[PDB]
Design a protein around this ligand. Structure first.
Ligand SMILES: CC(C)(O)c1ccc(-c2cc(Cl)cc(C3(C(=N)N)CCC3)c2)cc1
Length: 141
């Protein structure tokens, strides 16, 4: 699906950030990484909303209380995905400020801590994307 490809571009970019390689460390102290993640996040959420909209053209007619519930559960699952991606961006903004506060001292321990936290944020994003995909797959029925 288009929204899955969009999410995958966010995911591959974030897998690169996770390496904290020389060029990642450089781009994390500018706005570049968080600006590129914002663009990738925005595209994912736009495609998700359009996908849900087109799915609603080929629905199995069910009880109206049921449809209303499934739609609200799907909107909550979309919301969690967007919040997850924003939580990632926010953690990388935090890193930028903590490096500046070090006034040129070594950042090795900040980077060890960031790597560990990013791994956990990425696991949560993956969890939520799988749950969203599963909900979308039975939504029409
Ligand atoms: C081909 C490309 C661009 O490299 C790529 C495309 C998609 C993903 C991807 C990332 C995540 Cl977090 C989740 C999923 C969903 C999955 N489990 N298939 C769960 C809904 C689909 C897919 C990763 C990479």
């Amino acid at each position: 699906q288009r929204w899955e490809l969009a999410l995958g571009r966010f995911w591959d970019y974030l897998r690169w950030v996770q390496t904290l390689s020389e060029q990642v460390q450089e781009e994390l102290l500018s706005s570049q990484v968080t600006q590129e993640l914002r663009a990738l996040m925005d595209e994912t959420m736009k495609e998700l909303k359009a996908y849900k909209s087109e799915l609603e053209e080929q629905l199995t007619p069910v009880a109206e209380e049921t449809r209303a519930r499934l739609s609200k559960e799907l909107q909550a699952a979309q919301a969690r995905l967007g919040a997850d991606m924003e939580d990632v961006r926010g953690r990388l903004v935090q890193y930028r400020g903590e490096v500046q506060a070090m006034l040129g001292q070594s950042t090795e321990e900040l980077r060890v801590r960031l790597a560990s936290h990013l791994r956990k944020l990425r696991k949560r994003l993956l969890r939520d994307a799988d749950d969203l995909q599963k909900r979308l797959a039975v939504y029409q029925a």
